[PDB]
Amino acid sequence: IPEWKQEEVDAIVEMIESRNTLLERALDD
Amino acid sequence: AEFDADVIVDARDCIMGRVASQVAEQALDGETVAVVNAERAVITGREEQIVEKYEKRVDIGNDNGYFYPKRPDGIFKRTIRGMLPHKKQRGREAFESVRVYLGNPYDEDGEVLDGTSLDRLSNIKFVTLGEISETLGANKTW
Amino acid sequence: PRVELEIPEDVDAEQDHLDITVEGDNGSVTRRLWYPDIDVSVDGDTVVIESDEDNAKTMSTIGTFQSHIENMFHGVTEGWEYGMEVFYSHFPMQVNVEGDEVVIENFLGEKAPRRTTIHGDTDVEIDGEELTVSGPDIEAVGQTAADIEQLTRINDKDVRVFQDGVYITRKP
Amino acid sequence: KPASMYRDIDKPAYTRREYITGIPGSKIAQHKMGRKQKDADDYPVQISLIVEETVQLRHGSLEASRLSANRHLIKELGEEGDYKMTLRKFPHQVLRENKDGMRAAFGKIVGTAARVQAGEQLFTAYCNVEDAEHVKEAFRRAYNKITPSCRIKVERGEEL
RNA sequence: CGAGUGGCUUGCUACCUCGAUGUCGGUUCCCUCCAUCCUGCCCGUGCAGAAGCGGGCAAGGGUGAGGUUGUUCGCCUAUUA
RNA sequence: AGCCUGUGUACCAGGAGGGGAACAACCCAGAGAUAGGUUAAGGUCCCCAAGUGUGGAUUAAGUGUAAUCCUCUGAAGGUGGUCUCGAGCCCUAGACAGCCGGGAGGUGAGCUUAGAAGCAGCUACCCUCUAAGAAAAGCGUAACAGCUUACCGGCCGAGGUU
Numbered sequence: 001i002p003e004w005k006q007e008e009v010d011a012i013v014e015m016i017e018s019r020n021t022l023l024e025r026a027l028d029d
Numbered sequence: 030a031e032f033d034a035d036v037i038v039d040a041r042d043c044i045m046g047r048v049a050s051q052v053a054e055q056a057l058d059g060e061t062v063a064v065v066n067a068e069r070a071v072i073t074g075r076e077e078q079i080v081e082k083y084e085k086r087v088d089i090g091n092d093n094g095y096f097y098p099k100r101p102d103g104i105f106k107r108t109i110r111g112m113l114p115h116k117k118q119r120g121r122e123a124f125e126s127v128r129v130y131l132g133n134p135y136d137e138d139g140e141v142l143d144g145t146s147l148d149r150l151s152n153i154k155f156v157t158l159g160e161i162s163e164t165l166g167a168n169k170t171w
Numbered sequence: 172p173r174v175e176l177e178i179p180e181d182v183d184a185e186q187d188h189l190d191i192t193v194e195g196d197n198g199s200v201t202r203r204l205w206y207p208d209i210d211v212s213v214d215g216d217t218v219v220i221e222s223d224e225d226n227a228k229t230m231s232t233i234g235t236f237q238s239h240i241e242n243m244f245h246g247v248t249e250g251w252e253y254g255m256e257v258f259y260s261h262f263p264m265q266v267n268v269e270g271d272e273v274v275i276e277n278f279l280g281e282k283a284p285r286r287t288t289i290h291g292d293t294d295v296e297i298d299g300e301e302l303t304v305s306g307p308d309i310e311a312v313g314q315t316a317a318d319i320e321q322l323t324r325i326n327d328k329d330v331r332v333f334q335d336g337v338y339i340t341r342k343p
Numbered sequence: 344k345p346a347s348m349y350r351d352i353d354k355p356a357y358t359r360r361e362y363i364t365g366i367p368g369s370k371i372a373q374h375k376m377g378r379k380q381k382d383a384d385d386y387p388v389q390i391s392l393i394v395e396e397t398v399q400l401r402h403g404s405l406e407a408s409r410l411s412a413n414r415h416l417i418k419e420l421g422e423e424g425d426y427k428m429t430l431r432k433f434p435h436q437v438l439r440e441n442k443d444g445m446r447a448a449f450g451k452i453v454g455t456a457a458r459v460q461a462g463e464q465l466f467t468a469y470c471n472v473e474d475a476e477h478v479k480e481a482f483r484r485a486y487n488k489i490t491p492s493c494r495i496k497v498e499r500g501e502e503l
Numbered sequence: 504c505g506a507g508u509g510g511c512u513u514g515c516u517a518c519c520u521c522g523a524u525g526u527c528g529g530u531u532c533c534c535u536c537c538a539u540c541c542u543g544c545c546c547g548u549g550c551a552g553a554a555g556c557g558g559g560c561a562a563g564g565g566u567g568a569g570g571u572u573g574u575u576c577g578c579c580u581a582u583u584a
Numbered sequence: 585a586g587c588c589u590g591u592g593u594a595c596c597a598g599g600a601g602g603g604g605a606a607c608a609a610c611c612c613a614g615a616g617a618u619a620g621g622u623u624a625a626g627g628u629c630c631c632c633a634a635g636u637g638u639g640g641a642u643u644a645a646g647u648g649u650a651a652u653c654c655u656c657u658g659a660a661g662g663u664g665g666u667c668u669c670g671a672g673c674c675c676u677a678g679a680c681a682g683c684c685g686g687g688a689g690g691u692g693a694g695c696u697u698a699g700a701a702g703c704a705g706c707u708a709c710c711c712u713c714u715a716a717g718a719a720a721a722g723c724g725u726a727a728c729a730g731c732u733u734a735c736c737g738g739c740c741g742a743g744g745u746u
């Protein structure tokens with residue numbers, strides 16, 4: 001439940017809106 | 030040369046001490062025993078400390094004398110004598126009706142006494158009588 | 172514990188009793204893998220190392236049996252090679268293969284030739300100031316190389332000044 | 344003289360100064376070290392060296408251990424480091440030596456020692472969570488200069 | 504400062520022996536121990552080399568002749584691995 | 585001290601027999617003769633009467649197979665030899681390790697100093713780009729270079745670490 005990983009999955013989804021697991025995470029959103 | 034053995038034991042891969050204890054018990058019961066393949070009998074432990082003990086016995090001595098055997102032949106038979114009152118009539122009789130051999134001079138194949146077998150697959154720390162004799166300096170006549 | 176090693180298509184591994192033999196295009200290697208209650212067997216397309224015990228001492232040998240077998244796989248296909256270099260400061264050292272042993276002459280001026288016998292089917296090919304030890308048995312090759320370097324060992328004098336000798340340059 | 348000569352409690356308590364004279368002075372320079380103006384409560388960590396066997400420790404040994412311990416604490420935290428260590432025992436027991444055979448053998452006075460029951464704290468330090476390991480090292484050097492084995496026990500301290 | 508091993512020194516004890524277990528030193532002759540002085544093989548060096556210094560394995564062999572002194576010990580001399 | 589000198593008690597002395605290798609006082613035991621039986625201490629692989637007994641675990645040193653003791657040694661200190669139990673933290677949102685790639689600029693910070701550029705000394709230690717990167721944790725240089733720790737990404741795939 002690392003917070004920085006959670007904040008990253010968000011930041012990533014943010015740039016997707018406008019690590020690889022984290023990218024695949026955001027893509028899953 | 031020719032030994033009417035009521036029992037022929039196969040020492041191969043068998044714990045010497047355990048075999049000897051039974052062969053003694055039987056010789057005292059009147060059985061004529063012939064231990065076969067002595068060179069292949071085995072004794073557990075760390076080869077290094079085992080050999081130190083047998084080498085020490087070879088070095089002990091004096092004018093009175095402490096003749097200790099080097100061949101697997103005698104090593105084994107002396108092992109048995111230490112389990113017999115060989116200085117008593119009944120004891121010397123038992124002992125003398127027991128003989129150890131290198132290889133197997135008989136036609137039959139000796140039997141394997143219960144509890145005396147060693148599983149090579151589950152054991153690495155053990156040594157062969159033949160190996161000990163070779164270290165002691167014996168002439169590998171087997 | 173049980174580990175399964177899928178054998179390379181290039182190779183074929185047979186084993187009877189405590190001896191395992193691996194053959195490939197580069198040759199064959201036979202080893203004895205004997206340890207209390209560790210059974211090694213060839214189950215068709217894979218080699219199996221298993222035991223009912225899981226103590227540290229047993230686990231140690233299992234992992235050891237594994238690398239020994241994989242090394243055999245590698246040895247019979249790609250093979251093993253160590254590269255060595257002969258170096259001298261004043262006296263031209265002469266390294267040569269003669270028979271089944273490598274002979275070194277004129278080491279530090281010595282009149283008597285230093286030599287060492289080669290282990291197994293290890294090939295020691297020398298070219299100029301370069302040597303290449305190779306073969307399928309890593310044990311045999313590894314030693315031969317090492318032996319060659321040990322052959323110029325010096326204890327009497329300061330090694331920092333007298334650095335002549337052959338050294339392993341590349342470990343496989 | 345070997346400590347084997349006096350490390351055991353095999354004699355009556357002999358401490359009455361009113362009936363004993365010529366008692367040598369103690370070699371223990373200090374019982375309170377570090378910043379002795381500050382309280383022990385002012386520290387997050389409290390570590391004590393505990394003796395594991397009942398014994399007698401001659402003042403010569405207390406000085407050697409204390410010294411070899413505080414010395415380390417000084418070398419690692421400075422001549423004024425923020426720590427404080429205490430040697431809580433004093434050598435009350437008087438020691439003799441019969442230095443003429445076994446005739447009129449009562450020994451002449453030769454020294455002093457402190458009786459320590461197993462489980463007791465000989466020394467106790469108070470430091471900040473930082474220097475917690477420096478004191479453990481100081482004690483390691485300390486129990487090397489006294490007869491019994493010892494447990495280095497961290498009392499007040501859970502930054503572990 | 505602390506922990507030990509040995510049983511060569513010395514002390515302590517008084518267990519053995521006072522219807523007797525003859526001294527010290529030496530000599531001669533035999534066996535042994537290792538805590539190794541040399542020799543063999545090693546490691547480190549404030550190891551360039553040479554010669555050293557320190558340490559490890561190791562008891563197979565060797566460890567001698569002389570001046571004072573009854574001396575043991577030790578001091579001294581020339582040889583010596 | 586198998587020492588000297590007290591005290592209480594049981595023992596030897598003056599106490600057999602059984603056990604303890606042997607052994608005045610340690611264990612069982614206090615004993616008329618003779619006989620049968622059952623135990624005690626102690627023991628049951630052989631010597632030597634009785635188990636090569638059962639369920640389970642540990643030990644690899646022949647440790648050990650030595651109740652007591654002048655008699656049976658083994659200490660302070662040390663041990664990633666091995667087995668067992670507990671606590672905290674990290675981990676399939678990929679941990680620990682390894683290997684591959686990145687380790688960037690303002691800028692060789694300022695100061696001192698001929699010089700100093702992460703790294704002689706002193707002060708400070710800020711912000712950019714970014715998925716990372718110290719005003720530099722350790723080497724290295726005359727000073728640079730060079731070599732790496734921090735820190736990030738990949739490969740891998742299961743426990744790891746205190």
Ligand SMILES: CC(=O)NC[C@H]1CN(c2ccc(N3CCOCC3)c(F)c2)C(=O)O1
Nearest residue numbers: 519520521522523524525526527528574575
């Ligand atoms: C002959 C004799 O008396 N035999 C009976 C005993 C005593 N003893 C003995 C005692 C003292 C001495 N000495 C030696 C030198 O210092 C003075 C006493 C001694 F030589 C010998 C010995 O061996 O056996």
Ligand SMILES: [Cl-]
Nearest residue numbers: 090091094095
């Ligand atoms: Cl003899």
Ligand SMILES: [Cl-]
Nearest residue numbers: 114115116117
């Ligand atoms: Cl007899």
Ligand SMILES: [Cl-]
Nearest residue numbers: 152153154207
């Ligand atoms: Cl084994």
Ligand SMILES: [Cl-]
Nearest residue numbers: 599613614615
């Ligand atoms: Cl009675």
Ligand SMILES: [Cl-]
Nearest residue numbers: 078079082646
């Ligand atoms: Cl033994």
Ligand SMILES: [K+]
Nearest residue numbers: 520521523524
């Ligand atoms: K006498």
Ligand SMILES: [Mg+2]
Nearest residue numbers: 517518519520
């Ligand atoms: Mg007397």
Ligand SMILES: [Mg+2]
Nearest residue numbers: 537538539561
């Ligand atoms: Mg030695």
Ligand SMILES: [Mg+2]
Nearest residue numbers: 327328550555
């Ligand atoms: Mg030299």
Ligand SMILES: [Mg+2]
Nearest residue numbers: 535562563564
């Ligand atoms: Mg000799």
Ligand SMILES: [Mg+2]
Nearest residue numbers: 596597598608
């Ligand atoms: Mg009497």
Ligand SMILES: [Mg+2]
Nearest residue numbers: 054632633634
């Ligand atoms: Mg019987």
Ligand SMILES: [Mg+2]
Nearest residue numbers: 646647648649
């Ligand atoms: Mg023992």
Ligand code: NA
Nearest residue numbers: 046072073074
């Ligand atoms: Na045995």
Ligand code: NA
Nearest residue numbers: 087089090095
């Ligand atoms: Na003999």
